């Protein structure tokens, strides 16, 4: 998208594999605020937002908290307390045409700065002077958007860059976007400290003799003690016999 009409993708109810992003050698900018990139697979959020647009390389520095400039002031504004990641890469191969690509625009004129995450798509003729414009261009009456001139011969700072801004939102609602939380192999007939789906304990896991229902996960003895569990991956029921102990 053009930065003035930046696109927002709302991400919900899915497992996020951030290893695809920080293990990629194709990004020139990868700055995160209020969060560590490698430590992102262990966090759940209520919503994740992915905002994307194209700007100049000169202007990627404005996609950050506390910045000013035409992009931060009038096109895309991040809050001071931003919690997320700003990702960018050079796209001169895609977004520059030989005669000059003009499909990408930015807002040049606006009476006041954008609020954080505000999106202004107005095309109203801007009144730079005393006389009203009445929607007609002319002196002191300017179309508010300007075109980027993306040509391959531009210096790096003037070449197009694609930007993705990830915002991480933690509300008092169910968290629907988490990270992988992989597992390992299981061993039987040996004392292990185990952590199944929501429960944790210590004991020996053995092949069972019970017939759990298709929806039952955790067993329970008469005295409210965990007795058997359903392995999340293999559809096998494991009896939990606490590891041997006794007085000496």
């Amino acid at each position, epitope marked *: 998208a053009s930065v003035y009409a930046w696109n927002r993708k709302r991400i919900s109810n899915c497992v996020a594999d951030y290893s695809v992003l920080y293990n990629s050698a194709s990004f020139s900018t990868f700055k995160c605020y209020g969060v560590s990139p490698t430590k992102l697979n262990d966090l759940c959020f209520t919503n994740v937002y992915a905002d994307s647009f194209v700007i100049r390389g*000169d202007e990627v520095r404005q996609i950050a908290p506390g910045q*000013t*400039g*035409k992009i931060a*002031d*009038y096109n895309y504004k991040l809050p001071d307390d931003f919690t997320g990641c700003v990702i960018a890469w050079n796209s001169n191969n895609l977004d520059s045409k030989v005669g*000059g690509n003009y499909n990408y625009l930015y807002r*040049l*004129f*606006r*009476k*006041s*700065n954008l609020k954080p995450f505000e999106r202004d798509i107005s095309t109203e003729i*801007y*009144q*730079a*002077g*005393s006389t009203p414009c009445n929607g007609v261009e002319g*002196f*002191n009456c*300017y179309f508010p958007l*300007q075109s980027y*001139g*993306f*040509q391959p*011969t*531009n*210096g790096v700072g*003037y070449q197009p860059y694609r930007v993705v801004v990830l915002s991480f939102e933690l509300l008092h609602a169910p968290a629907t976007v988490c990270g992988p939380k992989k597992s390992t192999n299981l061993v039987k007939n040996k004392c292990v400290n185990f952590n199944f789906n929501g429960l944790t304990g210590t004991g020996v896991l053995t092949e069972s003799n019970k017939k759990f229902l298709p929806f039952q996960q955790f067993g329970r003895d008469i005295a409210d003690t965990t007795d058997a569990v359903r392995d999340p991956q293999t559809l096998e029921i494991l009896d939990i016999t606490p590891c041997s102990f006794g007085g000496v």
Partner: antibody
Amino acid sequence: EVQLLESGGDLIQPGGSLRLSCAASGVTVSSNYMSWVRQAPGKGLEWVSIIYPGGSTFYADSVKGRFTISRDNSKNTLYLQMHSLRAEDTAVYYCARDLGSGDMDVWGKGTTVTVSS
Amino acid sequence: DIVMTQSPSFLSASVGDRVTITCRASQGISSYLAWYQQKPGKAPKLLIQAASTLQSGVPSRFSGSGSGTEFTLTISSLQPEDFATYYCQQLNSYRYTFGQGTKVEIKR
């Protein structure tokens, strides 16, 4: 008609302070990119400072930390407050309206600043 | 950063001549270039913006063109009021860089 009328230039010692004013007519200062540009005796043009319509301000490296650009909406007037003046600040100072990309179409007649011991 | 080299510093022409002033950027600036005219004791006057858009009211003589790294101002038919100094300016830049200027003088 459309005119920018600047004033306040004077002879001043190094380390002194001076405020330049730029009263506008035909253009609304608060709605425009407004800049100060200077020209030392016998030299070329040097951009000094700019204030965006939204209020953001930016400065050339040669004046950063010493000059401040501001404006008064009720007076439709642009200002340049200069502190810690140096001999190399000696110039004619113009205020100009910036059409957005740096192309300035409305200029004042300029006011002359001389900094010397 | 991007350095604007304007050539020549001085050029002599006659009334009615076709004049070509060159402004070279140290790397590609698309069409982000403006041209100014300044006469002694007067404020600069904007002639062309965006490398090829003659400002309203400027006579048809002044022609601007060029793209990428080499830009030119062309005065198709020099008139007596065109002997002056001309400046290029990089547009859409954090630095607002100007060229050194070209003084067009009376040939004899």
